[PDB]
């Protein structure tokens, strides 16, 4: 189901909710060391220590087939408010 | 405090921009009159270049000094059951 405040206003957020979940695995592989520095009396500041292992970039993963099928389901239930001969595409965000 | 900061000891390629800045700084110790030179790793979205020499500062420090989370307290959401008062 989609839900809206109302669809034809382009300021209020169309929010869509679906049935089957999409399992998303997200990870940081950079192995971190905690280090305590005492600031003064009892102010135990915490910092990163040394990076061991191999330095990478943290990243999220989703499966392809569930994403393609759930995007098919949300474009199927999003076409009902707009007429049936409607090309629907998706972009990323634009600024901010 | 003003930071003295460098790259982390990594094989740098020109296209990938470095995500870690290894900064070292002055910090007070438990006794107020002695001070220590300590070193930390920071992420590049939390440090700015103040204006050869590359001295840096934390991004919050021209807004407001701000608060460490305690490592006692966790961050995972427990459920909340909302409930109605009498009447």
């Amino acid at each position, epitope marked *: 189901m989609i839900r809206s405040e109302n669809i034809t206003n382009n300021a209020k957020n169309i929010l869509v909710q679906f049935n089957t979940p999409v399992q998303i695995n997200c990870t940081r592989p950079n192995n971190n060391t905690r280090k305590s520095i005492r600031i003064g009396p009892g102010q135990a500041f915490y910092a990163t220590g040394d990076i061991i292992g*191999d*330095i990478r970039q943290a990243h999220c993963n989703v499966s392809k087939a569930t994403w393609n099928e759930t995007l098919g389901k949300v474009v199927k239930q999003l076409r009902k408010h707009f007429g049936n001969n409607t090309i629907i595409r998706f972009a990323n965000s634009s600024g901010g | 405090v003003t930071l003295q900061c460098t790259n982390v*000891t990594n094989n740098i390629t020109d296209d990938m921009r470095g995500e870690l800045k290894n900064c070292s700084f002055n910090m007070t110790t438990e006794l107020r009159d002695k001070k220590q030179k300590v070193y930390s790793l920071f992420y590049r979205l939390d440090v700015v270049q103040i204006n050869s020499n590359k001295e840096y500062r934390l991004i919050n420090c021209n807004t407001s000094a701000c608060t460490q989370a305690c490592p006692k307290v966790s961050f995972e959401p427990i459920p909340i059951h909302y409930c109605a008062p009498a009447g």
Partner: antibody
Amino acid sequence: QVHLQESGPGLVKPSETLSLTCNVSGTLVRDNYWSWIRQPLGKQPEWIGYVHDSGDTNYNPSLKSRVHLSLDKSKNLVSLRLTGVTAADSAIYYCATTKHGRRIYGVVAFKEWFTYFYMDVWGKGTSVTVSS
Amino acid sequence: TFVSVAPGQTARITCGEESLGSRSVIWYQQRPGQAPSLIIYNNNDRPSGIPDRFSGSPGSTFGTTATLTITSVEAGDEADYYCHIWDSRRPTNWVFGEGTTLIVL
């Protein structure tokens, strides 16, 4: 079958231009990266570097200026051209072939991987020192 | 650096800086007075021209030095070994490590 064959003048003057080549047997220069390694006497050797057609010609950044690597696609040989010799190049010099690979340690599509060379064969070694 | 091992025993030769990334060591065998040669071309993979008992270090752990283990050393292993590291975190070492030599009784 492979065998290699270096060349050098050997006994040369300081501040000069030194040119060495290496010979082929069976294979060509198109199919493999080639590599040049020098070695001072009783010391650890030094890799000058490697060469390939189509731009795959990264040098050592230690020397970086006085070196020239080149192929010979007609004569099917490989050649180095050194200029301005100092006494630190008093060395056995070496041509070599190499094969590459992909050491991969993370995500492949964030360029979190690198290459290794390894020099499988060597030449005969040519003692070129510099004196008067 | 000049480890002298009597034959039939087990040699363990170390070289190079401690590991800071995933490591791709190449070991070279050097016949004395002749040309050098290759012996180990991945961490623990051997190519042809040479049999087993040259076990290379697993490079997968962190904070270690490159160990090359030989068992049942013979007189043909009177050679000079060269470590050559290819790390992930470091830049490319264009210069090999130290000259270590194995002497057989």
